[PDB]
Design a protein around this ligand. Structure first.
Ligand SMILES: N[C@H]1[C@H](Oc2ccc([N+](=O)[O-])cc2)O[C@H](CO)[C@@H](O)[C@@H]1O
Length: 850
């Protein structure tokens, strides 16, 4: 019943190994080999040892010779075996791209068999294993994402020098008797009332001994005892199906905010001769999911019978696939701190623990294959990725079986994308559907994340029309352009491009001269944007920032304007889709922001940066996604209330006020007695009229109060009397140019205000600290304290990260007070007392003790 991951390896280039057979012989010398932990790419292993500077800074990654990664590298380990009575197996996946496998001088598997990142291998090495010191070695071949059914980085970042070659999941050493237990899972089916489920337990037993046996498979499913006895011929594998098990009042799994995140346990042992031979423990959730096309042709998800608007981001692992379990949890927790409900994984499908965490937190996941490389090479024409040859087909199908077997019992998974870009052809699709059936993977299959249909499954119900680069806030409210990215159908991957991180992050990833070029010449190429020619620079972003904000006087000026622009755009992107969700015709049914995060330190396509810091894009997404939310429509000036929560809400008041930048109120409307339905429904409070006398740049202050009088949402917009307008005829695949630009440059001369700050911290018994900050606009005039950003810092003024605030980037009118709460691990203070840095657009910067 043992399965123990190999904790580490020593690695070296095959340039240093003239005899392959020598490596896995006990006693082979490994002087100058690099010790690496489990789940290391070659380059990640070299970084672990010294060997190159931080690729997260400047052009360090460019200085790595890539030629050394065009030959195989060895991953070698010893294994102590005290007792060879039990059979021994190597059970693994995550090999990029393929490998020969050696035990004690014998090649047990070749790169023709061990091939493809997602394929699982269960190699019986019993005949090679002896008592005492054994040795195992993998010769890992170079990875080319265009040639290998593997992982590549598309245009998200820059290419890792080793192209991620290595072993990026665990290799398990399994020990068992005559019978191996494998692939234990639970088929679960809930009634529509959600008060009764039926559980079908299935498990494979394989008799690897020389003689026929009887084996009993027995244990517990969801607290209920189960047992089957089968006969097995020598070398026979069988799937055991247990009689149906009913479960009353099941603890149903819900997405975060809709109920609990319970998972039941499955615990089985296969016994031979009244003695345990092998054992397996797993979990599953009792949850129904569906994803169907609505009458308008949009893909509509529902969980447990409740339709949902998908509100998420494209998730990526680290650029060098460096795995850390706490980091994965910190990233999924930020999803909820954002108010988001979903992450999409375009390829790069994370180890099991990532899905365990998403299960435990109630974050929905959308895994699938990626575009623009080998996966779509048979159907994607002139795009990157090679045509398929006959040997490709069984690798892809085994990759599908393996991932379907891994993912089937994680309730967070709401679908699998079998295509991205292009839907698979009939042959490929059939092999994917066959593999999923064989795995009992019963979740929705989506053919493409674009509008392209597959021959069997059919219409995707999704769109990939862009944009991926600057478009003004009003763009997102478009429904008229059927080949563009407005708020209708399922937006599977879209953003307004550039997302300048915080200054603290900037100073860690770029030199002073790289930063100087960034603000002085946005048209210049930035290594920390993209290898793509199209996304190599920040020109569209820089042009609109100047036009709309005003020319940047310095680096500080550029970064501050970037944050407002990013907050403004990301907010409108999400808010437009929340609004249109309940449209009768062509509703929005999903939005995946491109992207949630970056593989590395980046200037684009992120909400949170590589260090987990939180900028304007972060705060703007968090504002748009709050559970009871008030918002302003950029297209028609409607003020709209959204209720994300699982219950209808009544007696809400929506209060909207316009102010000139001198603080003069120019309009007020108070709309009382609003009711809004659950799970994404809306109510319109008012349409703001054209108001005479507004400054060119003006403020809209929107406030939602419940029936108790509590303020539950505040949303402040900086607006212009001059419209952003689109030149739709100049549209390209990744953006639409503007025919005219809003004028928000009035903010440059917004007069100074004042805050107003007191902070205190409590170190909890759960290992976390909560810092509470009370901020007040203490000025003596009519000016708001606008866009006030509070940051937990140590004594050196460095941000404590990760961190989760209840609210931030707040605006307060004179005399107004807000109390804010930040939570973080006490240990991330690293012994420092906490302080709070408070910076506002028109309030300066101060830091206070906490
Ligand atoms: N799925 C990818 C998406 O792929 C596309 C392929 C073709 C078209 N097209 O021809 O309109 C549009 C998008 O492109 C994004 C931006 O380049 C990538 O970052 C995503 O990973």
């Amino acid at each position: 019943g043992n399965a123990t991951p190999i904790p580490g390896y020593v690695i070296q280039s095959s340039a240093q190994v003239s005899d392959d057979s020598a490596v896995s012989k006990p006693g082979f010398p490994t002087s100058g080999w690099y010790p690496v932990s489990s789940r290391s790419t070659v380059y990640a292993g070299l970084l672990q040892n010294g060997k190159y500077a931080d690729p997260f800074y400047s052009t360090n990654m460019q200085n790595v010779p890539a030629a050394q990664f065009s030959v195989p590298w060895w991953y070698r380990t010893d294994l102590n075996v005290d007792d060879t009575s039990s059979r021994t197996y190597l059970d693994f996946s995550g090999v990029l791209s393929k490998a020969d496998v050696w035990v004690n001088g014998t090649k047990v598997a070749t790169k023709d068999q061990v091939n493809g990142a997602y394929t699982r291998h269960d190699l019986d090495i019993t005949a090679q294993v002896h008592t005492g010191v054994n040795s195992v070695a993998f010769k890992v071949y170079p990875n080319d994402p265009n040639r290998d059914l593997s992982m590549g980085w598309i245009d998200w970042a820059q290419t890792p020098p080793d192209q991620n070659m290595g072993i990026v999941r665990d290799v398990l050493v399994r020990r068992s008797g005559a019978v191996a237990l494998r692939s234990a899972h639970v088929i679960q089916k809930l009634n529509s009332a959600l008060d009764h489920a039926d559980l079908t337990v299935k498990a494979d037993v394989r008799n690897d001994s020389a003689n026929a046996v009887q084996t009993t498979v027995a244990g517990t499913v969801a607290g209920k005892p189960i047992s089957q006895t089968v006969s097995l011929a020598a070398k026979e594998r069988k799937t055991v199906t247990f009689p149906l098990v009913g479960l009353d009042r099941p603890n149903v799994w819900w997405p975060a905010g809709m109920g609990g995140q319970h998972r039941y346990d499955l615990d089985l042992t296969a016994s031979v001769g009244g003695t345990p031979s092998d054992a397996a423990k797993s979990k599953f959730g009792v949850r129904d999911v569906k994803a169907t096309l609505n009458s308008s042709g949009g893909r509509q998800y529902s969980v447990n019978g409740k339709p949902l608007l998908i509100r998420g981001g494209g998730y990526t692992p680290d650029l060098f696939l460096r795995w850390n379990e706490t980091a994965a949890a910190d990233k999924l927790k930020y999803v909820l701190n954002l108010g988001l409900n979903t992450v999409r994984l375009e390829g790069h499908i994370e180890p099991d623990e990532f899905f365990d965490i998403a299960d435990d937190l109630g974050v929905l996941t959308m895994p699938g294959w990626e575009c623009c490389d080998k996966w779509e090479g048979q159907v994607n024409g002139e795009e990157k990725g090679e045509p398929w040859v006959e040997s490709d087909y069984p690798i892809a199908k085994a990759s599908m079986f393996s991932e379907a077997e891994r993912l089937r019992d994680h309730p967070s998974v709401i679908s699998f994308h079998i295509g991205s870009a292009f839907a698979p052809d009939r042959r490929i699709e059939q092999g994917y559907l066959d593999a999923m059936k064989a795995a009992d993977f019963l979740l929705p299959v989506i053919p493409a994340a674009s509008a392209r249909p597959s021959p069997i499954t059919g219409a995707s119900g999704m769109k990939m029309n862009g944009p991926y680069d600057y478009v003004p806030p009003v763009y997102w409210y478009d429904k008229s352009q059927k080949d563009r990215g407005g708020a209708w159908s399922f937006n599977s991957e879209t953003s307004a491009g550039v997302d300048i991180p915080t200054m603290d992050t900037l100073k860690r990833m770029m030199s002073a001269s790289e930063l100087d070029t960034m603000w002085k010449n946005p048209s210049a190429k930035q290594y920390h944007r993209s290898s793509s020619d199209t996304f190599g620079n920040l020109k569209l972003f820089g042009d609109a920032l100047t036009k709309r904000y005003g020319a940047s006087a310095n680096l500080n000026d550029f970064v501050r304007k970037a944050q407002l622009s990013q907050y403004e755009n990301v907010r409108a992107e999400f808010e437009s889709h929340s609004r249109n969700y309940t449209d009768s015709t062509n509703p929005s049914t999903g939005l995946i922001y491109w992207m949630l995060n970056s593989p590395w330190t980046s200037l684009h396509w992120q909400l949170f940066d590589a260090y987990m810091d939180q900028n304007g894009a972060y705060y703007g997404a968090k504002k748009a996604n709050e559970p009871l939310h008030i918002q302003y429509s950029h297209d028609n000036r409607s003020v709209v209330v959204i209720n994300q929560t699982s219950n209808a809400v009544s007696g809400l008041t929506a209060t909207t006020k316009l102010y000139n930048l001198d603080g003069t109120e120019k309009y007020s409307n108070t709309k009382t007695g609003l009711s809004v339905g659950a799970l994404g429904a809306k109510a319109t409070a008012v349409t703001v009229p054209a108001v005479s006398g507004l400054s060119t740049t003006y403020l809209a202050k929107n406030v939602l109060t419940d029936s108790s009088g509590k303020e539950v949402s505040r949303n402040v917009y900086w607006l212009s009397t001059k419209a952003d307008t689109l030149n739709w005829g100049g549209s390209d695949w990744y953006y639409t140019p503007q025919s005219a630009f809003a004028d928000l440059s009035g903010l440059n001369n917004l007069g100074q205000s004042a805050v107003g700050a007191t902070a205190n911290s409590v170190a909890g018994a759960d290992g976390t600290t909560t810092t509470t900050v009370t901020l007040k606009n203490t000025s003596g005039g009519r000016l708001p304290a606008f866009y006030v950003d509070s940051k937990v810092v140590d004594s050196a003024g460095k941000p404590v990260l990760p961190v989760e605030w209840n609210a931030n980037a707040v605006s307060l009118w004179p005399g107004e007070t807000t109390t804010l709460t930040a939570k973080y691990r006490t240990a991330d203070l690293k012994g420092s007392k906490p302080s709070v840095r408070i910076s506002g657009w028109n309030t300066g910067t101060q830091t206070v003790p906490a």
